[PDB]
Amino acid sequence: MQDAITAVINASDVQGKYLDTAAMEKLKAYFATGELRVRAASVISANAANIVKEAVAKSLLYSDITRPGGNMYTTRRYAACIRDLDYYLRYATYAMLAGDPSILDERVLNGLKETYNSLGVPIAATVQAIQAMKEVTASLVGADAGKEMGIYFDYICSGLS
Amino acid sequence: MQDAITAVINASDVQGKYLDTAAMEKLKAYFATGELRVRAASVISANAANIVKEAVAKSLLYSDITRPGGNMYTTRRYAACIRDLDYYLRYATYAMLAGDPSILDERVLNGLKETYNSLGVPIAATVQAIQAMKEVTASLVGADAGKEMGIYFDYICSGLS
Amino acid sequence: MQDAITAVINASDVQGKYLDTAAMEKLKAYFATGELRVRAASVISANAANIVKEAVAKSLLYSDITRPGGNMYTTRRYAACIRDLDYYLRYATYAMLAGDPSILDERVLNGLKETYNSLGVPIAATVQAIQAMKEVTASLVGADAGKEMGIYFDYICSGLS
Amino acid sequence: MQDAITAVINASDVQGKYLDTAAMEKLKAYFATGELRVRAASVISANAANIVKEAVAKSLLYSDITRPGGNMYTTRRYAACIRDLDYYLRYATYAMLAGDPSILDERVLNGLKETYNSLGVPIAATVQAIQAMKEVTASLVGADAGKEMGIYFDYICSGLS
Amino acid sequence: SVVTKSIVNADAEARYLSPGELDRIKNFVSTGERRLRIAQTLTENRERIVKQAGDQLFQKRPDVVSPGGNAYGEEMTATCLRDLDYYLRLVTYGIVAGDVTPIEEIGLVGVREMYNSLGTPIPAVAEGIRAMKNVACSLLSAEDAAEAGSYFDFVIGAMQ
Amino acid sequence: SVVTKSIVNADAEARYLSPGELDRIKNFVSTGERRLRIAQTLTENRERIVKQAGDQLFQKRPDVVSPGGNAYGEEMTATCLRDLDYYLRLVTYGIVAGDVTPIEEIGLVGVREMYNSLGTPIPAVAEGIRAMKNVACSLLSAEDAAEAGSYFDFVIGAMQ
Amino acid sequence: SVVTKSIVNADAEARYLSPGELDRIKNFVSTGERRLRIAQTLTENRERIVKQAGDQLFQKRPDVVSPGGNAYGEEMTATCLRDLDYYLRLVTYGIVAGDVTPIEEIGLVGVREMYNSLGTPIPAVAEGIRAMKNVACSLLSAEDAAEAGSYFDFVIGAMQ
Amino acid sequence: MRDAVTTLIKNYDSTGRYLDRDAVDRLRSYFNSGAARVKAAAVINANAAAIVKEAASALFTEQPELIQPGGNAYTTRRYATCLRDMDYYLRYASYAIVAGDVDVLNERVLEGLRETYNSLGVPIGPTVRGIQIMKEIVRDRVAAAGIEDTGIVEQPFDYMCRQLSEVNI
Amino acid sequence: PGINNQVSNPGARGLTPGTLGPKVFKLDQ
Amino acid sequence: AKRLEIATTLTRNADIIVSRAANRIFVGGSPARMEKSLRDLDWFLRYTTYAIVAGDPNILAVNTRGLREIIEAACSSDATIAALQEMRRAALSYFEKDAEAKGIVETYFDVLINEFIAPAPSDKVRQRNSTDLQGLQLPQIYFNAAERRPKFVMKPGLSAAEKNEVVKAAYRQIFERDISRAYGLGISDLESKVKNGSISMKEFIRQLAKSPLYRKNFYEPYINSRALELAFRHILGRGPSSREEVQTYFAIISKGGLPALVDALVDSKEYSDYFGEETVPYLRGLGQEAQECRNWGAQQDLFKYSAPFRKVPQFITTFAAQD
Numbered sequence A, B, C, D: 001m002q003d004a005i006t007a008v009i010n011a012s013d014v015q016g017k018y019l020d021t022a023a024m025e026k027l028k029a030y031f032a033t034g035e036l037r038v039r040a041a042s043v044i045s046a047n048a049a050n051i052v053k054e055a056v057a058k059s060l061l062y063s064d065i066t067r068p069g070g071n072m073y074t075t076r077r078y079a080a081c082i083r084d085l086d087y088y089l090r091y092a093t094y095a096m097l098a099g100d101p102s103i104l105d106e107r108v109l110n111g112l113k114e115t116y117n118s119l120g121v122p123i124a125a126t127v128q129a130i131q132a133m134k135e136v137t138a139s140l141v142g143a144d145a146g147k148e149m150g151i152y153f154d155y156i157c158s159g160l161s
Numbered sequence E, F, G: 001s002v003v004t005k006s007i008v009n010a011d012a013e014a015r016y017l018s019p020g021e022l023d024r025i026k027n028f029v030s031t032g033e034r035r036l037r038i039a040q041t042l043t044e045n046r047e048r049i050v051k052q053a054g055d056q057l058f059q060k061r062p063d064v065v066s067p068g069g070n071a072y073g074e075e076m077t078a079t080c081l082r083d084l085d086y087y088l089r090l091v092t093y094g095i096v097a098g099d100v101t102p103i104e105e106i107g108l109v110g111v112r113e114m115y116n117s118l119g120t121p122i123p124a125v126a127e128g129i130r131a132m133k134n135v136a137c138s139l140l141s142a143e144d145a146a147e148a149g150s151y152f153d154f155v156i157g158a159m160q
Numbered sequence H: 001m002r003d004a005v006t007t008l009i010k011n012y013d014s015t016g017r018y019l020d021r022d023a024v025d026r027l028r029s030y031f032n033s034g035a036a037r038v039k040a041a042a043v044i045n046a047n048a049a050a051i052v053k054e055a056a057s058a059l060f061t062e063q064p065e066l067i068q069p070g071g072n073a074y075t076t077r078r079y080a081t082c083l084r085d086m087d088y089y090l091r092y093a094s095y096a097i098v099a100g101d102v103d104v105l106n107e108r109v110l111e112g113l114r115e116t117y118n119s120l121g122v123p124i125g126p127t128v129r130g131i132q133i134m135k136e137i138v139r140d141r142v143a144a145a146g147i148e149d150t151g152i153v154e155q156p157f158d159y160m161c162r163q164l165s166e167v168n169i
Numbered sequence I: 001p002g003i004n005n006q007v008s009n010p011g012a013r014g015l016t017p018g019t020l021g022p023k024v025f026k027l028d029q
Numbered sequence J: 001a002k003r004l005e006i007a008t009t010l011t012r013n014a015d016i017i018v019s020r021a022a023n024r025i026f027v028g029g030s031p032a033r034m035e036k037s038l039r040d041l042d043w044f045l046r047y048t049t050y051a052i053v054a055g056d057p058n059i060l061a062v063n064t065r066g067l068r069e070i071i072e073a074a075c076s077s078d079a080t081i082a083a084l085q086e087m088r089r090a091a092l093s094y095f096e097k098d099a100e101a102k103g104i105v106e107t108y109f110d111v112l113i114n115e116f117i118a119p120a121p122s123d124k125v126r127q128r129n130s131t132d133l134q135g136l137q138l139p140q141i142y143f144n145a146a147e148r149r150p151k152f153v154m155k156p157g158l159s160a161a162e163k164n165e166v167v168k169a170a171y172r173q174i175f176e177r178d179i180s181r182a183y184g185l186g187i188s189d190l191e192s193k194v195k196n197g198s199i200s201m202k203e204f205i206r207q208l209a210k211s212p213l214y215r216k217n218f219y220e221p222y223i224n225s226r227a228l229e230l231a232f233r234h235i236l237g238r239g240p241s242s243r244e245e246v247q248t249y250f251a252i253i254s255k256g257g258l259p260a261l262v263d264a265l266v267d268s269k270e271y272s273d274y275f276g277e278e279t280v281p282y283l284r285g286l287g288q289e290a291q292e293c294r295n296w297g298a299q300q301d302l303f304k305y306s307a308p309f310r311k312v313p314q315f316i317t318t319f320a321a322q323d
């Protein structure tokens, strides 16, 4: 797993050059947003359950997905679906804190299509739900953190697609 | 596993409908077959070793399978083959009791064809052997439940094929 | 089909270096055995039908295999079996000329077990008949070539088993 | 083979609903970004060979991969590798035009990892090269369209890895 | 079902069905007709059971149906009634199966997670199923009511 | 090798190696000692062959070493000289094998695609191999040089 | 074999072969000539060994070849003698190897299972192998016979 | 895991043949050369560390790019793991010299090696060259020790190189 | 028929499979 | 911001730092070893710059722990050590004005000096208990660099939150997910028992694995061979290594089923050696433990949350096909 600092250092290391001024600028931007990232992460931790509640209500609830035979019908399936939305939120928070999408690729997207295609989970509905989570989260954390968390939510959406 | 009861109720559950009168007729048929099925299961339970012995004699033994270099040669492999035939007998009897071939599909057939092709197990000999088991079992448990055991034995043959 | 010379030059090529004196020693060795290899190939080519005729007579004829239901019974199946024995002889001769079992691995033994097990061909009997061909061939080409034709025939038998 | 427009209408079709206002908003978004997508596609079309050449130089040349014994060393292997990079770039361009990575799914990634693992192609090295192609493409088409190309290159990398 | 329960346990033990378990499924097949009759009466009176038991639930806990409660408004209160209907259907499935197995799969797994996230009070849901159990007891004969009572009881216990 | 090329073309027709092909292999194995000597001399003189031939190629086609060509600067020029070394090595492998098969598979298949995607003039590469052929003629005896010239000719034939 | 046992244990250690282990297999390859001679005596005289061991089996345990027994019949008794031949062949393999693991791999892993399936008295099979041991010891010298007996007796012990 | 004796036994058992004179001749060849094989493996075991060190230095002087920041051995973390791989090859090759058969190498070293190296990013070509450098060093050492036939000691390394390398036909 | 196999009987490509294989449709006029 | 500042200043005066240290260590000077020494001095400083930019000096620690033994022969270790002190003094000089900058740079260079002096550690030699398996020795620096799994232990007298967390970790490993957190499914009696200490964590794992939850989740869904492979992952923390392992345990699962296989795997010496009676099983991956060439792809796929969805048995097919 790589944070932005790890990626910058490793690129410089492969080239062999000492950390260049442009690399310093990238690292400086990450450090500068550090306060915003930590603050937003605490907001996510406090409001994560309701973020999921609102997102499911926005898209998945009162839909064919929750109808019998719709793949979130069973209570098992509903509990698992909200868990997976919790997973996406949790790993999006991790990705925001680190500043790099490597957490998402290493842990979330190295088995996601296999699991969902095997189970029959509807990828389109999950994508709609994650987009809804992005909007709700952006409202709670503000625009600056809504942009940052948004790119990682988009990463998960496109990977699922 | 789905037995006949679970299959009927799950089929109704997918639609979302309470158990219909037609579904009740299906369930009543299973309950009617229950006595003959349980009796036959006890017959196979006590005569399991004899069924395997007779079948291996009828088909597998005294052929190229047991001559040196024939895959059933070596005492390790002869033991392994009779173990697999008893696997088939046990799961087929499970399927006779339950009334649905989902036990065969879940616990036997899925992946077995790949493992057998990887290990080099002759697949024609396995099908001939389990068909021989069907002949022996028909004799022991009688024709009416031999009708029933055949359905699940044939299921295994088709899956291995 | 990698031969001894192609294998030597390939290995030197992988290292990247021009042909070394040690590699020249190996190539000289193969050139030394060239006389026996070419002579044996000429003998096998001329007597190929007789090699197979003697092997079929020694091992397969007047057995259950050649009698009704034995898999060499039908005229189609008999001709196919002798054709297969020709296959093994021809590719063993190719392997002897090359000095390398790569042709056997690549063309002959790849999926041979799976094709035979699908067709219902007794692989034990095919191994025994290949041994009969090995003995007849050893007699025809003499101990020098029979030792090498032995290693390639036994390569086939080991894989086919 | 779904583009963004087809995906929007297909989801509506499965639900059995005429196009909703939210779906209209999504379609408006695709139409809004269409001009930059088309412009970048034509730029990549003009610079297609150069993009691949620069990526090979930046990530693969003068490395273990192309030096002897490295799996891009032989001339046939070099030609094959650049052919695959051409394939990646062309389907990434198709994906940018369509707005959907589904083309990458169906036409590139449906069996690619198994073929590469079987052939012996180093997945990590290919991923390095595809990442370098992302950098070159971003420069050629401009940063704004470069983010769009980046997501589809990342899709290829996620599936290939 | 009893059959599936026996076969699952015996499959894990790699053992042909024990003679006692074979007798158990024999008793299940004999009792099946009574089970089907119990399911028949409950499903035939399903509209009565859900309707009057739902009235009892809302009467017992009006705060639940009051404004600010989860079933506030016509739409939400209708869906709450639908949940009661769902659980009656699952109870009929359980009665036919002869074991909680179907109800303990289709519902009763992660109900706490689903409902608690949904916002609903799960003790109130349990009270609703209790009301359905009372109505079903009135519609059933004494011994028949005991078995159906067992399946309803499993539901309310899982709710609590 | 001549052995595998004979086997491959006989395998296509499903025949045992015909007497003419067997005779060809017999001659090849007998003269293998001479072949190894020819490759030994070229291997020993590889540094001189590459250096002299490179100078001749650059003199005849100065555009490649001029700015705007593939080999401008000592870095790119060194890689071009290495490629000439590669093809000398492949020719040595060809002499020892007795056939063009090592040359074809290692370094004549996809040459157009590789060098075109490297930005290199393939006709100039062909002339470079021609220069190496002349140098090799100087360093080999007449009868040997004719045989080695055949492998050089095959390289230039596919190149141009 | 001694060599494989040493290599396997050393590999599990993840240390190069110990000097003591190397000396042990030095002894093994030194005594290889004696091992090969003992194996060849048994192999070349296999016909007599099997026939006399068959006589001792069918007289010490006359029931097995009597009517109703496993070996009753012109062909059933032939297959029994073939089994004795199989185990003699395995014993020769083991004598060459210096270890009983070739014998144990090809037979004695599941002999109880195989013979219980075939309805054979495995004590009677054991007595047949003991007859083989007696016959073979007289075809070998006293010092050599002790080695052969070890491989004939591991088999019998496993037969029980 | 099969020795020469175990391999001959395995072939003959699959074919159901008592060991004939040809089998005895090949077994005798292994037994006769077993003493030399033991001495050669003892030499390798005694000088195992030194062989690894010399081979590593020779490989990196031959191919500087590995030690440079781009290469896979650049930092000391990977330098240690790379030296361990050299030790692996020497250890299993000494096992193979004792065994007299390359089945040990095939089953425990070469199987899955390319997959592992492609996934971890390890370059296979340099590794093949390193094994070859071990082969030459080891052959020199056993020849100095007095083992006349170095065919026994070089062939396991050669088999590792052939299996680990690509075709490059 | 396995006697007619392009690996072994490369010449006999076009000899009809016959009753042992699929039907072969040919256009005549 | 201070870390980047220290990095910029260190880079700016980097040539001076190296030259001062080089003069200090110029003992027996005069060639090839000179190129090595100068370049390695540069590398020391560059990784110090990388470390100060990074959160921790772990890059320096893991990448220099064994260096002294590796480079001891060619050049004097004491010479290296003294030159390292010289570089520390010059680096301290440029930042001597500022307390925070001086503290950070001094501490990180101090780690470098201490690690070089410290005795090189022995490899994490993996001695396999059984014959069929192959032993392997990961170098210690690699394991230190590897990400570290939270090695939960059910020690006596733990914090209340810790006891609940250890139970959660066991649920996560055995059932591949936190079923208690998501569905609320769990075995309440067993959790309470091991929290009380009435049963060991090994007993908790045994009971959990042979519980009906595991039987429904990972033995019922699959053919027996795939069930075996999943069991190795969950209960033992690795995938089967050889055909002898698959043969042994397929026979076990054939003769006794899931109760038998659970007993065999927990009883195994391998369990006791790596997961004591208190420890909760943890997956042993590329960095945690030395790895083998024979089951690479199968192990890679088993150590994934998508692993339960293969129902074709990959380990047996792979090992069988290898022969």
Ligand SMILES: *[C@@H](C)[C@H]1/C(=C/c2[nH]c(/C=C3N=C(/C=C4\NC(=O)C(CC)=C4C)C(C)=C\3CCC(=O)O)c(CCC(=O)O)c2C)NC(=O)[C@@H]1C
Pocket (backbone or CB within 6 Å): H067, H074, H075, H076, H079, J032, J033, J034, J035, J036, J037, J038, J040, J041, J043, J044, J047, J063, J064, J067, J070, J071, J074, J075, J076, J077, J079, J080, J083
């Ligand atoms: C000895 C007094 C000094 C010295 C000289 C020297 N160094 C090497 C080679 C290596 N030194 C290292 C050490 C590191 N390399 C790194 O990249 C890092 C972290 C960024 C460290 C700490 C390495 C890896 C090598 C190369 C591999 C090897 O073992 O050789 C040599 C050997 C000759 C050569 O050119 O390679 C010599 C003589 N280096 C010192 O650090 C001392 C001050």
Ligand SMILES: *[C@H](C)[C@H]1/C(=C/c2[nH]c(/C=C3N=C(/C=C4\NC(=O)C(CC)=C4C)C(C)=C\3CCC(=O)O)c(CCC(=O)O)c2C)NC(=O)[C@@H]1C
Pocket (backbone or CB within 6 Å): A057, A061, A062, A063, A066, A067, A072, A073, A074, A075, A078, E057, E064, E065, E069, E070, E071, E072, E076, E077, E079, E080, E081, E083, E084, E086, E087, E106, E107, E118, E120, E121, E124, E125, E128
């Ligand atoms: C009624 C006794 C209590 C109550 C419930 C209530 N539920 C919802 C919404 C939903 N309920 C479900 C339940 C199930 N889905 C299942 O698959 C099963 C098992 C077969 C069950 C029981 C679901 C899925 C929903 C979501 C909507 C949908 O069905 O798609 C609501 C509405 C919540 C809202 O505001 O959105 C309510 C009010 N409410 C009460 O007051 C009772 C105590």
Ligand SMILES: *[C@H](C)[C@H]1/C(=C/c2[nH]c(/C=C3N=C(/C=C4\NC(=O)C(CC)=C4C)C(C)=C\3CCC(=O)O)c(CCC(=O)O)c2C)NC(=O)[C@@H]1C
Pocket (backbone or CB within 6 Å): A060, A065, A070, A071, A072, A076, A077, A078, A080, A081, A082, A084, A085, A087, A088, A107, A108, A112, A115, A119, A121, A122, A123, A125, A126, A129, J177, J305, J306
């Ligand atoms: C919710 C938006 C949609 C949905 C989901 C649904 N998911 C599952 C089950 C699983 N989900 C995963 C995914 C993950 N596992 C992880 O560890 C991570 C993070 C690294 C993710 C993203 C897995 C592995 C499973 C299966 C194992 C399990 O049950 O947990 C289900 C259950 C399907 C079933 O019945 O077996 C469902 C229903 N369902 C929807 O309708 C939404 C569109």
Ligand SMILES: *[C@H](C)[C@H]1/C(=C/c2[nH]c(/C=C3N=C(/C=C4\NC(=O)C(CC)=C4C)C(C)=C\3CCC(=O)O)c(CCC(=O)O)c2C)NC(=O)[C@@H]1C
Pocket (backbone or CB within 6 Å): B061, B062, B063, B066, B067, B072, B073, B074, B075, B078, G057, G064, G065, G070, G071, G076, G077, G079, G080, G081, G083, G084, G086, G087, G106, G107, G118, G120, G121, G124, G125, G128
């Ligand atoms: C003889 C001492 C006793 C005895 C034996 C008996 N055996 C059989 C039949 C078979 N025996 C085998 C045995 C082996 N297969 C192996 O791979 C090996 C190791 C290499 C052994 C030992 C097998 C496979 C068979 C089946 C037939 C076949 O070979 O295909 C019989 C015939 C049984 C029958 O009725 O069919 C008998 C009688 N019988 C005795 O009385 C002795 C005490």
Ligand SMILES: *[C@H](C)[C@H]1/C(=C/c2[nH]c(/C=C3N=C(/C=C4\NC(=O)C(CC)=C4C)C(C)=C\3CCC(=O)O)c(CCC(=O)O)c2C)NC(=O)[C@@H]1C
Pocket (backbone or CB within 6 Å): B065, B070, B071, B072, B076, B077, B078, B080, B081, B082, B084, B085, B087, B107, B108, B109, B112, B115, B119, B121, B122, B125, B126, B129, J223, J224, J225, J226, J246, J247, J250, J316
């Ligand atoms: C018997 C009819 C034929 C036959 C088979 C044979 N099988 C094996 C070994 C294995 N068999 C299995 C089978 C299963 N695994 C399962 O999970 C299930 C479903 C519950 C089945 C049926 C497996 C996994 C193996 C491999 C593990 C092992 O080696 O035991 C062998 C032995 C192979 C060996 O080399 O030892 C044999 C011989 N052989 C025949 O001749 C019959 C036609």
Ligand SMILES: *[C@H](C)[C@H]1/C(=C/c2[nH]c(/C=C3N=C(/C=C4\NC(=O)C(CC)=C4C)C(C)=C\3CCC(=O)O)c(CCC(=O)O)c2C)NC(=O)[C@@H]1C
Pocket (backbone or CB within 6 Å): C061, C062, C063, C066, C067, C072, C073, C074, C075, C078
């Ligand atoms: C008689 C008119 C001519 C003749 C024939 C002859 N044939 C054989 C031997 C064999 N013949 C067959 C033939 C068939 N196998 C089949 O399945 C079918 C179709 C149903 C046929 C026709 C076979 C298989 C053999 C081999 C021996 C065996 O059956 O095991 C012989 C013996 C040859 C020998 O040397 O063994 C002879 C003499 N001979 C004549 O003179 C007539 C012109």
Ligand SMILES: *[C@H](C)[C@H]1/C(=C/c2[nH]c(/C=C3N=C(/C=C4\NC(=O)C(CC)=C4C)C(C)=C\3CCC(=O)O)c(CCC(=O)O)c2C)NC(=O)[C@@H]1C
Pocket (backbone or CB within 6 Å): D057, D061, D062, D063, D066, D067, D072, D073, D074, D075, D078, F064, F065, F069, F070, F071, F076, F077, F079, F080, F081, F083, F084, F086, F106, F107, F118, F119, F120, F121, F122, F124, F125, F128
């Ligand atoms: C010289 C006659 C012409 C020329 C060449 C030139 N070549 C390169 C770089 C490479 N050449 C190759 C070619 C091969 N690889 C092989 O495996 C084989 C056969 C065994 C051949 C012929 C490769 C792979 C490269 C690049 C990667 C590498 O490191 O080898 C260049 C440099 C290209 C660049 O821009 O970087 C040049 C210039 N230049 C000329 O002027 C001649 C006409």
Ligand SMILES: *[C@H](C)[C@H]1/C(=C/c2[nH]c(/C=C3N=C(/C=C4\NC(=O)C(CC)=C4C)C(C)=C\3CCC(=O)O)c(CCC(=O)O)c2C)NC(=O)[C@@H]1C
Pocket (backbone or CB within 6 Å): D065, D070, D071, D072, D076, D077, D078, D080, D081, D082, D084, D085, D087, D088, D107, D108, D109, D112, D115, D119, D121, D122, D125, D126, D129
């Ligand atoms: C290039 C970045 C890397 C690389 C690749 C390499 N690939 C091959 C051969 C093949 N590649 C494919 C890939 C695809 N097939 C597809 O349909 C698609 C989607 C459009 C892709 C990406 C296939 C099928 C082959 C097989 C063709 C064949 O027979 O080879 C090779 C050739 C291997 C060989 O031995 O000839 C190579 C070298 N190699 C590298 O070094 C790069 C890291």
Ligand SMILES: *[C@H](C)[C@H]1/C(=C/c2[nH]c(/C=C3N=C(/C=C4\NC(=O)C(CC)=C4C)C(C)=C\3CCC(=O)O)c(CCC(=O)O)c2C)NC(=O)[C@@H]1C
Pocket (backbone or CB within 6 Å): H066, H071, H072, H073, H074, H078, H079, H081, H082, H083, H085, H086, H088, H089, H092, H108, H109, H110, H113, H116, H120, H121, H122, H123, H126, H127, H130, J136, J138, J286, J289, J290, J291, J292, J293, J294
């Ligand atoms: C050295 C000459 C080249 C090199 C090697 C290198 N290897 C690794 C790591 C591993 N190597 C293996 C190899 C094996 N494992 C085995 O079980 C066997 C069978 C004997 C072999 C050959 C494995 C499994 C690993 C990874 C896990 C582990 O080490 O146990 C690395 C580390 C790669 C990294 O970045 O972490 C390297 C670098 N490196 C070179 O530069 C040489 C060209």
